[PDB]
A paper describes a structure:
Cthe_2751_is a 15.8 kDa singleton from an anaerobic, hyperthermophile Clostridium thermocellum, with an unknown function. Therefore, based on primary sequence analysis, Cthe_2751 is a non-Pfam singleton with an unknown function. Each monomer is made up of 8 α-helices arranged in a spiral pattern around a vertical axis that runs through the centre of the protein. The structure reveals an all α-helical topology similar to those observed for nucleic acid processing proteins.
Cthe_2751 crystallized as a dimer in 3 different crystal forms. Superimposition of the dimers crystallized in different space groups revealed no obvious differences in the position of the Cα atoms suggesting an identical mode of dimerization in all the 3 crystal forms. To find out if there is a difference in the packing arrangement of the dimers in the 3 crystal forms and to quantify it, a computer program was compiled and a calculation was performed to analyze the inter-dimer distances of 2 neighbouring dimers for all 3 space groups. As expected, the inter-dimer distance between 2 closest dimers in space groups C2221 and P4122 is relatively similar when compared to that of the distance between dimers of space groups P212121 and C2221 or P212121 and P4122, where there is almost no recognizable co-relationship. This result further supports the inferences of crystal packing analysis where we saw that the dimers rotate less than 3° along the C axes during the transformation from P4122 to C2221 resulting in only a minor change in crystal packing. A mathematical calculation performed on the dimers of Cthe_2751 crystallized in different space groups corroborated the findings of the crystal packing analysis of molecules packed in different space groups.
Author numbering:
A (entry chain B), B (entry chain A): 2 to 129
């Protein structure tokens, strides 16, 4: 329950950031998904401090990242893909390729879809 | 020199990437600066696979990032700032603030420098 207190409570809340920046992968794992939720919108002031943390602990983040990519929250997967994919070390990069391919193949029916299809296409082109 | 064999030999050389991704901070330290040199130009194909490694070992990378920001290689410091600064965890972010401040204050005499001055400005505004 002490760990869960380290989770930001609102979009401006960096009170726990120093404590967070100190944990090892297995110390932060239990709340990694909770931290990833603060990337649903990167324009939230706290997203800029959460992002480095989750990238640094990317290896234990992966199953949760895939869940997001397999979800229906377009904005959330857009930020996750855009911000995290270029900073995934090789083995983790290969884990998410599947989702990028899938997303790049979607029919473009609105602008939100077009954004994530074109990002997926550019990222497959560049990174893989 | 077993370790140095993991430094890519040329701008397409990803032959050592799998091994690099298995090291921890203190193993990789002795070549972190050699790895940082591969960000002198992020269009080099190997750069995209080195960036995840250097960010992941950012804590032993900081004195060497400072050295790069204190050098006179424009493009190198453009990429290092642009690519690494958003992904520094709080305490490493703090260490580099000084160099950003200094760079945003440079008189723009050689116009090639503008991108560094203005990037530092933008990043001071956004991340701090």
């Amino acid at each position: 329950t002490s760990l869960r207190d380290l989770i930001p409570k609102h979009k401006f809340d960096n009170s726990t950031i120093d404590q967070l920046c100190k944990l090892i992968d297995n110390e932060i794992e239990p709340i990694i998904f909770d931290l990833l939720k603060w990337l649903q919108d990167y324009n939230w002031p706290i997203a800029k401090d959460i992002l480095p943390v989750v990238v640094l602990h990317q290896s234990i983040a992966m199953p949760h990242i895939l869940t997001i990519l397999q979800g229906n929250d377009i904005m959330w997967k857009y930020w996750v893909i855009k911000l995290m994919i270029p900073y995934l070390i090789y083995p983790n990069k290969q884990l998410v390729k599947s989702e990028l391919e899938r997303l790049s193949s979607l029919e473009i029916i609105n602008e939100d879809i077009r954004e994530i299809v074109n990002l997926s296409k550019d990222y497959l082109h560049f990174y893989y």
